[PDB]
Design a protein around this ligand. Sequence first.
Ligand code: MG
Ligand code: MG
Ligand code: MG
Ligand code: MG
Ligand code: MG
Ligand code: MG
Ligand code: MG
Ligand code: MG
Ligand code: MG
Ligand code: MG
Ligand code: MG
Ligand code: MG
Ligand code: MG
Ligand code: MG
Ligand code: MG
Ligand code: MG
Ligand code: MG
Ligand code: MG
Ligand code: MG
Ligand code: MG
Ligand code: MG
Ligand code: MG
Ligand code: MG
Ligand code: MG
Ligand code: MG
Ligand code: MG
Ligand code: MG
Ligand code: MG
Ligand code: MG
Ligand code: MG
Ligand code: MG
Ligand code: MG
Ligand code: MG
Ligand code: MG
Ligand code: MG
Ligand code: MG
Ligand code: MG
Ligand code: MG
Ligand code: MG
Ligand code: MG
Ligand code: MG
Ligand code: MG
Ligand code: MG
Ligand code: MG
Ligand code: MG
Ligand code: MG
Ligand code: MG
Ligand code: MG
Ligand code: MG
Ligand code: MG
Ligand code: MG
Ligand code: MG
Ligand code: MG
Ligand code: MG
Ligand code: MG
Ligand code: MG
Ligand code: MG
Ligand code: MG
Ligand code: MG
Lengths: 76, 94, 56, 136
Amino acid sequence: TRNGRDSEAKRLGVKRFGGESVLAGSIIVRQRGTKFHAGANVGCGRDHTLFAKADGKVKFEVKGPKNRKFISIEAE
Amino acid sequence: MFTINAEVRKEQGKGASRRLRAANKFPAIIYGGKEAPLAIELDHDKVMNMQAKAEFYSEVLTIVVDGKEIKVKAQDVQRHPYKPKLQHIDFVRA
Amino acid sequence: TIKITQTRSAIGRLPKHKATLLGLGLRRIGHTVEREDTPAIRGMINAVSFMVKVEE
Amino acid sequence: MLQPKRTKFRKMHKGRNRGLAQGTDVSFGSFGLKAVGRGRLTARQIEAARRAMTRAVKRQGKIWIRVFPDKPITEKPLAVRMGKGKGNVEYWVALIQPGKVLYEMDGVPEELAREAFKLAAAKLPIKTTFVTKTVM
RNA sequence: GUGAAGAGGGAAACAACCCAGACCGCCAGCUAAGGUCCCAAAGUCAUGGUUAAGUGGGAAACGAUGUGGGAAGGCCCAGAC
RNA sequence: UCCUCCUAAAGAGUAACGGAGGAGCACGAAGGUUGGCUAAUCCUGGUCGGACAUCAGGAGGUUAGUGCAAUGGCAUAAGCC
RNA sequence: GCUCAACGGAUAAAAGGUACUCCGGGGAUAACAGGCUGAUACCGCCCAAGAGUUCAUAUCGACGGCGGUGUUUGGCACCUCGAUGUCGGCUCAUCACAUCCUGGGGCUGAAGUAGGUCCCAAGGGUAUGGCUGUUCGCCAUUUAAAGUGGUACGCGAGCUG
RNA sequence: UGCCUGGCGGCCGUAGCGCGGUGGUCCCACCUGACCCCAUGCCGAACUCAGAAGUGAAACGCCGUAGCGCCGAUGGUAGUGUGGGGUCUCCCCAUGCGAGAGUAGGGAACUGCCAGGCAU
Ligand SMILES: [Mg+2]
Ligand SMILES: [Mg+2]
Ligand SMILES: [Mg+2]
Ligand SMILES: [Mg+2]
Ligand SMILES: [Mg+2]
Ligand SMILES: [Mg+2]
Ligand SMILES: [Mg+2]
Ligand SMILES: [Mg+2]
Ligand SMILES: [Mg+2]
Ligand SMILES: [Mg+2]
Ligand SMILES: [Mg+2]
Ligand SMILES: [Mg+2]
Ligand SMILES: [Mg+2]
Ligand SMILES: [Mg+2]
Ligand SMILES: [Mg+2]
Ligand SMILES: [Mg+2]
Ligand SMILES: [Mg+2]
Ligand SMILES: [Mg+2]
Ligand SMILES: [Mg+2]
Ligand SMILES: [Mg+2]
Ligand SMILES: [Mg+2]
Ligand SMILES: [Mg+2]
Ligand SMILES: [Mg+2]
Ligand SMILES: [Mg+2]
Ligand SMILES: [Mg+2]
Ligand SMILES: [Mg+2]
Ligand SMILES: [Mg+2]
Ligand SMILES: [Mg+2]
Ligand SMILES: [Mg+2]
Ligand SMILES: [Mg+2]
Ligand SMILES: [Mg+2]
Ligand SMILES: [Mg+2]
Ligand SMILES: [Mg+2]
Ligand SMILES: [Mg+2]
Ligand SMILES: [Mg+2]
Ligand SMILES: [Mg+2]
Ligand SMILES: [Mg+2]
Ligand SMILES: [Mg+2]
Ligand SMILES: [Mg+2]
Ligand SMILES: [Mg+2]
Ligand SMILES: [Mg+2]
Ligand SMILES: [Mg+2]
Ligand SMILES: [Mg+2]
Ligand SMILES: [Mg+2]
Ligand SMILES: [Mg+2]
Ligand SMILES: [Mg+2]
Ligand SMILES: [Mg+2]
Ligand SMILES: [Mg+2]
Ligand SMILES: [Mg+2]
Ligand SMILES: [Mg+2]
Ligand SMILES: [Mg+2]
Ligand SMILES: [Mg+2]
Ligand SMILES: [Mg+2]
Ligand SMILES: [Mg+2]
Ligand SMILES: [Mg+2]
Ligand SMILES: [Mg+2]
Ligand SMILES: [Mg+2]
Ligand SMILES: [Mg+2]
Ligand SMILES: [Mg+2]
């Protein structure tokens, strides 16, 4: 009548959580906005995916002057 | 002439303070200035006949704890939302 | 030293308390077992602390 | 009566009814009548109690209502099989949890206020009892 | 989580509830859930209070000098009722 | 058939004849880059000008905007020349 | 190039009727009756603005509150489809009591007469006809009274259709 | 070494707004003047250049500042895993974990590589 539709979401959120070790090319956070920002040695894609450039351990770091979540990459 | 006779609780927190509430008592706290927060119990029905006057909340109180008549004033009070009771009082050291 | 016995059964209880008895090796009522001591063993006994009797 | 002039969306869910109160003490006047049980207050009962208590106050003093019903309760119409959607809003209900106050009064003395609140207590589905003005 | 694909004691019987997981044999001992006045096995076991209504052994709004315990007050040999 | 929030129980996912909404296009720039800039609203003064055109400061600080639904973003602007 | 839009797309191409019907199944799934809640129905209670010359309580009760009974209209699809015959009459009943009559007591805005209204009481009794297929209903006419319900809305291995 | 002032940093409202004073030798702003160097969708307002008569008024840092905002106790609160119940539409028990809002309070930043001026 008026209430028939919905759409399943694109299975978003954090994929490689903060603390463990990732490779290069894999994705950390598939997200909508710039919700977790442009952290150290990660790229924000076209659809603002957080993908690492180097290898090693991830770390969820607060930074910035407006309290923004940056997602970091350092060499393990 | 308003006085207070009380002693100090053994174990703190929720499950102990509920039995202390059941056993005709209720907690309090005494803070302020230089002395640390003193976490004592009180007598329930022996201060129900004392909180019935505004001089409780406008006059000095002498608490006899540790052999020391502390000179306090009433600070804040909590009550059971559907009971004629008392729950928890603050007392500043002033 | 420690000692452990199991007095209540485990059938109608959780799979979070049907795998601590794996790590305690208790396979029957009365299956008394001595193990080591550490904070981890006390933490693995305070999850099933309604159905064992410690013997010390 | 009371009713919302505007809801953002049309029909709300049921929820549940857990928790103690928030508006615990007398906040404006001198005398109060306070709920004890757990339940649900419609739009009609509170204004019926408002008339049944105004009739005892005889336009003297002042009274305050604080609760205001806004839950869009519904009904499924009679002789319709259970499917084919939800129903249309029939009346507007307030939620009353144990301890919440409903009305406050000033001016008119307390011994009149006993029976003046007892009459409006006798038209209400959950047991209430009187409380006074507490100086802190 | 039982139950379907699971037997057994307690809920009278009662797939789903609590106890508990029986491979076979014995005229052997300890308990769980639950019971101990006889039916049907085990306390008419001891102190210790309430109840007088078969309440126990079905229920609301409200009602009342039924009843037991606590906390205060006012009036009083300026004898209060 | 696809898209947005909620029900969905702090990660993904989770249904019904449950609660509300949008799409089946556009853009030769509304694209890439360089350089630069910053709002909605009311008060006050002013040629016809009124409660609302344009002009002046001035308060206030994204309460504004995105080619369109919401949701999440957005000042380094992804908003505007 | 394919609004295959019924959007994983059967064909390049497609609408209805069966009370003349037939088959495999189905209590997964409808009607009849049960069983489960009890929303509507009915009957007792609570507050008591008022009406009643005075007066809430003789009799009614506004705006509202809570239950009972399982009794109408309903909701779920459990037993029942390798079948339990269904409405109403005729013939036989039995229990329930929220009691129509009859029995005993209190109130009244009860002088007597006749009544109002609750409380105890279910032993016994409860219309013959006109009209439609009809329970009911309306009407004519008696009596102390022409009660209300469950029993597969009792009863077709008992009877009309 | 000490104090002050200039680009860059750590820092993320205890670091920001309030109101009252402040300091111009050097630095910074205002300022001065403008044809080619560039400049305005009109215009030395912005943007660029040349120079230093004049001022520290506005900007810009300091001290004073509880009107704020902000941080923040201890104590109590319902929630809450896991297990037993009850007067099972929701609450009580033994166990831990026990926050938001508010009370007592702090609170006018702090610091680092660098260059100049004045003093010790
Ligand atoms: Mg607890
Ligand atoms: Mg609430
Ligand atoms: Mg399973
Ligand atoms: Mg099967
Ligand atoms: Mg069995
Ligand atoms: Mg059995
Ligand atoms: Mg039974
Ligand atoms: Mg048996
Ligand atoms: Mg076995
Ligand atoms: Mg036992
Ligand atoms: Mg025996
Ligand atoms: Mg005995
Ligand atoms: Mg009762
Ligand atoms: Mg006398
Ligand atoms: Mg989720
Ligand atoms: Mg565009
Ligand atoms: Mg104007
Ligand atoms: Mg840009
Ligand atoms: Mg298909
Ligand atoms: Mg398909
Ligand atoms: Mg197909
Ligand atoms: Mg084809
Ligand atoms: Mg024919
Ligand atoms: Mg023919
Ligand atoms: Mg056939
Ligand atoms: Mg069959
Ligand atoms: Mg079936
Ligand atoms: Mg039917
Ligand atoms: Mg049926
Ligand atoms: Mg029926
Ligand atoms: Mg019933
Ligand atoms: Mg009766
Ligand atoms: Mg009278
Ligand atoms: Mg009456
Ligand atoms: Mg049947
Ligand atoms: Mg057969
Ligand atoms: Mg049949
Ligand atoms: Mg009777
Ligand atoms: Mg009579
Ligand atoms: Mg009889
Ligand atoms: Mg009879
Ligand atoms: Mg006889
Ligand atoms: Mg005849
Ligand atoms: Mg005829
Ligand atoms: Mg007839
Ligand atoms: Mg019937
Ligand atoms: Mg029937
Ligand atoms: Mg019948
Ligand atoms: Mg029949
Ligand atoms: Mg027959
Ligand atoms: Mg028949
Ligand atoms: Mg025929
Ligand atoms: Mg100043
Ligand atoms: Mg200044
Ligand atoms: Mg200038
Ligand atoms: Mg807390
Ligand atoms: Mg806190
Ligand atoms: Mg500060
Ligand atoms: Mg300042």
